[PDB]
């Protein structure tokens, strides 16, 4: 007969379900234990925020089998435009129940119109308000609720734990995770809901706020019932872009929810959320490829920036092999930041554009295929929030616009970033097509995607969980694992968070996930937690499960310390990863959870670890890991003490070295590494190993694992960048082993003799060991050394080749395409006066050769391995790439030789031999090996801004100089507020972005790139665009750049119209002549532009293209003419010995001696006599200007208003500085010559000019007591709050004497009284110390 309910049953449970609605009455387990569903007649369906209560005629039921039932719900509301038919299936399997919405029929629409058009009357949201799928009563024994919300704050737990009492009153209380326990059963609710709600702490959106569980209380007899329901689901959601265009986008997935009923799953004698959590893992969503996370021991970033190609793909593969040797083959995860376009923050959002200067898609695939053999996973950094005009994806529709209709501007660095319209990008199918472009290039070789900045709201004011879910789906659909930037971001699909794994970022409030519930469930699936960083406290003070601590050695934020990188892996990452090979089963006595933070019912046990924190983890093979805290009191030394046991045997003990690098610990471990570096399956008994580490060093005794108990000895190896070294046989006595270790030195333990990991250095690079990673042995096995001098592999960080004396280092070139053009470049730092060379030969015949003398330019590339902060020698690095261009012979025989000619004793450093296919053919030579012509349109640059090299205007930086790319009309002058062209000719140019008012060199040529012969004449020309007048100048110097040894020619404005520059150059006596671009002290004309228009306008920029350097015919001279010119120059300046500086006399004497050597050499010719004469003319012109500058500094000091005007009208530089850095303005302000101060400033003297002590002319004027000069300086734009080297401002100097009216004019102009010097003294403290009570009276 007719019954109102049915029974669904499994071997583990029976469930009663209502026929009139998809509700459960109760779950009965085989043991007889019961869990309630929804005891009340609740038949509510919410659609588009409208509640519709269903009647008996609105629902039809069908029992499909003993494990499945189907419901058809008629959901109608004429007033609110709702007429739907919802199909719901209820399935049961084991102890799990699933409730899925399998079909949604809309009787008010024909679906979504083509192109994601607006579906009118669309079912946007759907829910079952107070569905109470699982419920607990106040009348039940130990009725509890446990919830988790998102917390990125180390001091604020994301958990809540409370007893369900009669006073419990909740209504749609939203949680990421929710668990109810009562009467011996526990259950959690899982939903695929994209709803965003209540959170504890998160600095961003981007799926941080995803709450999927709704808790509600109802009255059930005289008891209070707490029921769990799903949060609402999105179906056909209507969204709006930044232009006001509306779209309807289909569901990411159909609505799904589930429960899993647990008993005492961990057999600890109690039933709580932890039991429900073990069961929950069977129903919960698992991030795509989360199964490989325990294998990723070595995370790091390989960095590329600004056309430099600091880390080409094949170099990254070599670093993978170096890390594999040092970790004995542990798994790696390499994030390629700058894989595309010109590097990092270039070419966004063109995901398919693989950096051609890195080796393109071919070398990227070789790196990924070969790297996989070593357990290395690769992934790329992408941006879906900011774009650049150069990117082919850049269009008007892609542009995010504000309410006013203007551009939503991002950051300006290399170029101006513009915000992407995130809603358009999703709804138009644009982002998905760009990811498809990348998928076509990488195939199935790439492991992950790294999504930067998602959640910071630069793509739109939403970037919700619904948006993040669609984003994660298009990425996962391409076989890629999801990773993101922010600690809290993408809770549903992310396996890694940069601001979680890199603990140095953003402080204690913006870290990884601070939840015991979340980390209990997912610790083994993600690197999204809080690791050790004592500084942050709370969760960051010695977490028992550890947490990933990420370091880098390949240029990310200038990180290059390989030793520190490896030390870090062993300090924190090996144990964190070991722990991730097990799943949490029990977690008692958590000190972070208290009654005060809403965790009164938190899991406690005074019979477990003395009432202190303990975590029990288990694997699928019944292996047990137990992690214990020494003390639960933070003021106790034992709070940081941790014991790890593997199957009851101690494998780790002690305090870890502070994650913040502040204090070293004492922790030692002997960890069993049982898994392969691939799918993490168990290795064979032969291949089983243990990793040993002793922080302080010394001797420790350990019990070996059970399978090792009957061995008589073990094989112990020390791990290095060369692999396994210093083999030791260690005795095993009673299944115990004694190990002697050096402090912070890795060791690997085997049962027997272990084989060396096979490594073939520099695969695909046409040479073996291009980076010199093969040790001293590389110079015997791979490279061949010849000569009387020495060849050595030097450097304990990034190994280089170091040559001394007459020595040649050669190697045969393999896999070259016959007849094809190649560029071969190599990093070179020559400290010797003797030539350092690179030569390509084919059977004793030179194909191409290049050489350098002493290196004259320090390396300022932050992302580069050998920048001037890395110390190649004597606290500096002059590493710069030296090129040879050749055609591969039909013969097939080619060899590279790196050599040193001198017997100097001084060193030459070589590194990274790069042979690459390249079409550059712009260098022509004379009959003798010298330069005839060099042309460059920058269309075929293998790497960097060659023949130029980046200078030190920003120090060691991610330099705002790169090769700009054409994408018309967006890169052209006229688009938006853009007044300058990015490109002048062809597709590429050299762009300088906003490096104005630096008063120093921006970039320069170097003799290894373009050699100017001594006395020879050259015509240099180029096409340019400059934002304002005299903001950039052509600089011409000899040797290492020094301020006040360079010839400067200010470039006029060429904004939107290409200018042409041309000048003549005479090669200096030492052959070290160069030309470059100099940033003057002159302020740019912003033409009334405001905000971002100042940077996007191009007023502060410099673009250079179509460089032409050609040797020119000079007027021929006889020996007589040259000898007479010697006499002329000697007649002029021989007497001037005392007048000029000692550095100027040696420069004059050097040039004069070298010119006379050319003249008087036996068998000298007309060319030698012409060169000698031209050197003397350039010497004359130099000495003339030097004399005028010295005379200007003497006229400004002595008080000669007439002479100052005369000298300035003739040629004397207004910004000339003496030995201590005093400009004529400094000397005029000090001595008290108001007229001279006015004259110099009228001409264009630098008012903010610093001497060696950091004193500006205002400091000098304030100290002396020159009111008149103080006022005129401030009027011209002098820095009122300018501080010297001791941090002394002009206000302090005026207070020192009692210059009352100077203090008045300073304070009027905005002098800050709060300014403290290095000794913490204000102007107030300096006045009281000198006995000036009248000055102290003011403030």
């Amino acid at each position: 007969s007719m019954v109102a309910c049915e029974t669904l049953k499994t071997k583990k449970m029976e469930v009663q379900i209502k026929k009139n609605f998809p509700s459960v009455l109760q779950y009965t387990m085989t043991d007889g234990k019961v869990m309630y569903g929804q005891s009340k007649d609740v038949r509510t369906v919410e659609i588009n925020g409208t509640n519709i209560e269903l009647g008996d005629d609105d629902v039809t039921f069908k029992k499909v089998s003993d494990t499945e039932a189907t419901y058809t719900l008629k959901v109608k509301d004429e007033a609110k435009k709702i007429d739907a038919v919802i199909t719901v299936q209820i399935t049961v399997k084991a102890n799990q129940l699933h409730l899925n919405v399998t079909k949604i029929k809309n009787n008010l629409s024909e679906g979504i119109p083509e192109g994601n058009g607006v579906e009118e009357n669309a079912i946007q949201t759907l829910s079952f308000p107070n569905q109470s799928l699982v419920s607990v009563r106040s009348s039940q024994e130990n009725a509890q609720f446990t919830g988790a919300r998102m917390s990125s704050n180390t001091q604020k737990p994301g958990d809540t734990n409370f007893a369900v009492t009669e006073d419990t009153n909740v209504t749609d209380s939203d949680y990421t995770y929710g668990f109810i326990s009562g009467a011996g059963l526990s259950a959690g609710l899982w939903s695929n809901s994209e709803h965003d709600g209540t959170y504890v702490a998160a600095p961003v959106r981007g799926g941080s706020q995803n709450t999927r569980v709704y808790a509600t209380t109802q009255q059930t007899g005289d008891a209070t019932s707490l029921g769990l329901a799903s949060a609402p689901w999105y179906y056909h959601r209507t969204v709006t872009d930044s232009k006001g265009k509306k779209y309807t986008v289909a569901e990411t997935a159909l609505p799904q929810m589930a429960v899993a009923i647990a008993g005492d799953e961990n057999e600890d004698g109690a039933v709580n959320w932890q039991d429900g959590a073990i069961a929950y893992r069977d129903i919960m969503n698992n991030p795509y490829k989360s199964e490989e996370v325990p294998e990723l021991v070595a995370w790091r970033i390989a960095m590329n920036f600004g056309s430099q190609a600091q880390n080409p793909f094949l170099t990254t593969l070599d670093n993978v092999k170096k890390v594999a040797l040092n970790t004995d083959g542990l798994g790696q995860s390499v994030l390629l930041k700058g894989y595309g376009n010109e590097g990092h923050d270039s070419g966004h959002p063109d995901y398919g554009d693989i950096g051609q200067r890195l080796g393109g898609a071919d070398d990227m695939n070789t790196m990924m295929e070969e790297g996989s053999k070593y357990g290395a996973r690769f992934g790329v950094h992408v941006n879906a929030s900011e774009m650049y005009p150069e990117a082919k994806a850049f269009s008007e529709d892609m542009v995010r616009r504000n309410s006013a209709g203007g551009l939503s501007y991002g950051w300006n660095w290399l170029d101006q970033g513009v915000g992407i319209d995130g809603i358009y990008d999703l709804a138009s199918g644009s982002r998905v097509s760009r990811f498809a472009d990348l998928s076509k290039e990488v195939g199935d070789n790439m492991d992950f995607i790294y999504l930067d900045v998602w959640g910071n709201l630069t793509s739109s004011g939403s970037e919700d969980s619904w948006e993040t879910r669609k984003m994660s789906k298009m990425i996962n659909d391409n076989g890629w694992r999801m990773t993101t930037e922010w600690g809290s971001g993408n809770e549903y699909d992310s396996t890694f968070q940069h601001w979680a794994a890199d603990l140095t970022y953003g402080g204690y409030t913006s870290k990884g996930e601070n939840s015991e519930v979340m980390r209990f469930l997912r610790n083994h699936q993600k690197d999204s937690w809080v690791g050790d960083y004592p500084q942050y406290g709370g969760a960051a003070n010695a977490p028992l499960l550890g947490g990933y601590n990420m370091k880098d050695f390949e240029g990310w934020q200038g990180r290059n310390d390989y030793a520190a990188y490896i030390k870090n892996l062993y300090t924190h990452d090996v144990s964190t990863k070991f722990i991730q090979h097990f799943k949490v089963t029990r977690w008692v006595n958590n000190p972070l959870l208290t009654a005060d933070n809403g965790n009164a019912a938190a899991v406690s046990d005074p019979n477990t670890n003395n009432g202190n924190e303990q975590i029990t983890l288990k694997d699928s093979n019944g292996n047990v890991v137990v992690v214990s805290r020494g003390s639960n009191d933070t003021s106790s030394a034992a709070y940081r003490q941790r014991t790890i046991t593997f199957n009851g045997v101690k494998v780790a003990s002690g305090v870890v070295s502070a994650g913040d690098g502040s204090a070293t610990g004492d922790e030692s471990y002997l960890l069993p590494w049982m898994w392969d570096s691939f799918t993490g399956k168990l290795v064979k008994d032969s291949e089983q190993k243990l990793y040993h580490w002793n922080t302080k060093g010394g001797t420790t005794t350990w019990t070996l694992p059970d399978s090792w108990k009957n061995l008589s000895s073990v094989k112990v190896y020390q791990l290095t960048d060369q692999g396994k070294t210093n083999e030791q046989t260690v005795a095993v006595s009673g299944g115990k082993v004694t190990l002697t270790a050096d402090a912070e030195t890795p060791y690997v333990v085997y049962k027997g003799e272990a084989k060396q990991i096979q490594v073939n250095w520099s695969e695909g690079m046409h040479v073996v060991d291009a980076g010199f990673n093969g040790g001293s042995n590389t110079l015997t096995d791979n490279w061949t050394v010849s000569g009387s001098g020495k060849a050595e592999v030097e450097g304990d960080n990034n190994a280089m080749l170091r040559l001394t004396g007459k020595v040649d280092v050669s190697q045969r070139l393999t896999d070259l395409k016959a007849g094809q053009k190649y560029a071969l470049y190599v990093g070179v730092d020559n400290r010797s006066t003797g030539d350092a060379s690179v030569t390509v030969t084919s059977g004793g015949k030179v194909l191409a050769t290049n050489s350098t003398g002493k290196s004259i330019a320090k390396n300022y590339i932050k992302a580069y391995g050998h920048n001037t902060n890395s110390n190649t020698e004597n606290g500096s690095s002059y590493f710069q790439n030296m090129y040879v261009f050749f055609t591969a012979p039909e013969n097939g025989d080619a060899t590279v030789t790196l050599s040193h000619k001198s017997t100097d004793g001084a060193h030459t450093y070589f590194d990274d031999v790069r042979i690459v296919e390249n079409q550059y053919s712009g260098i022509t030579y004379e009959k003798d090996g010298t330069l005839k012509s060099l042309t460059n349109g920058f269309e075929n640059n293998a790497q960097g801004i060659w023949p130029f090299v980046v200078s030190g205007s920003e120090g060691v930086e991610d330099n705002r100089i790169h090769l700009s790319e054409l994408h018309a009309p967006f890169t052209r002058a006229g688009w938006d507020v853009k007044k300058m062209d990015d490109v002048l000719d062809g597709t590429w140019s050299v762009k300088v972005n906003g490096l104005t008012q630096k008063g120093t060199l921006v970039y320069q040529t170097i003799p290894q790139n373009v050699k100017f012969e001594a006395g020879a004449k050259y015509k240099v020309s180029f096409d340019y665009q400059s934002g304002s007048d005299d903001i950039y100048a052509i600089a011409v110097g000899q040797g290492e750049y020094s301020a006040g040894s360079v010839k400067l020619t200010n470039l006029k404005k060429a904004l939107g119209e290409t200018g042409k520059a041309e000048f003549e150059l005479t090669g200096g006596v030492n052959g070290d002549s160069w030309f470059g671009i100099y940033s003057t002290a002159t302020a740019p004309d912003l033409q009334g532009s405001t905000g971002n228009a100042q940077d996007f306008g191009g007023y502060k920029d410099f673009v250079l293209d179509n460089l032409k350097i050609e040797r020119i015919e000079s007027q021929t001279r006889t020996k007589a003419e040259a000898q007479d010119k010697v006499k002329e120059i000697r007649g002029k300046y021989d007497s001037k010995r005392a007048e000029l500086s000692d550095a100027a006399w040696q420069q004059y004497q050097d040039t004069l001696v070298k010119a006379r050597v050319l003249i008087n050499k036996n068998g000298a010719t007309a060319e030698d006599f012409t060169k000698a004469y031209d050197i003397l003319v350039a010497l004359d012109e130099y000495m003339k200007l030097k004399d005028l500058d010295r005379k200007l500094l003497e006229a400004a000091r002595a008080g000669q208003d007439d002479e100052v005007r005369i000298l300035l009208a003739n040629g004397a530089d207004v910004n000339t500085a003496d030995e201590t850095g005093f400009t004529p303005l400094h000397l005029a302000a000090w001595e008290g010559h108001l007229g001279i101060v006015e004259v110099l400033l009228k001409n264009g003297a630098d008012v903010n000019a610093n001497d060696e002590r950091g004193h500006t002319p205002l400091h000098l004027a304030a100290y002396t007591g020159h009111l008149e000069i103080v006022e005129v300086l401030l009027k011209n734009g002098a820095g009122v709050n300018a501080t010297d080297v001791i941090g002394t401002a002009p206000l302090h100097l005026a207070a020192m004497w009692g210059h009352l009216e100077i203090v008045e004019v300073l304070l009027k102009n905005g002098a800050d009284v709060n300014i403290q010097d290095c000794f913490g003294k204000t102007a107030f403290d300096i006045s009281i110390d000198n006995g000036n009570e009248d000055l102290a009276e003011i403030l």
């Binding site: 005093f1222 000090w1230 002590r1253 000098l1260 100290y1263 002396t1264």
Partner: peptide, 10 residues
């Protein structure tokens, strides 16, 4: 600490 082109201390 020196301040000027002469021999002035501060």
């Amino acid at each position: 600490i020196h301040i000027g082109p002469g021999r002035a201390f501060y």
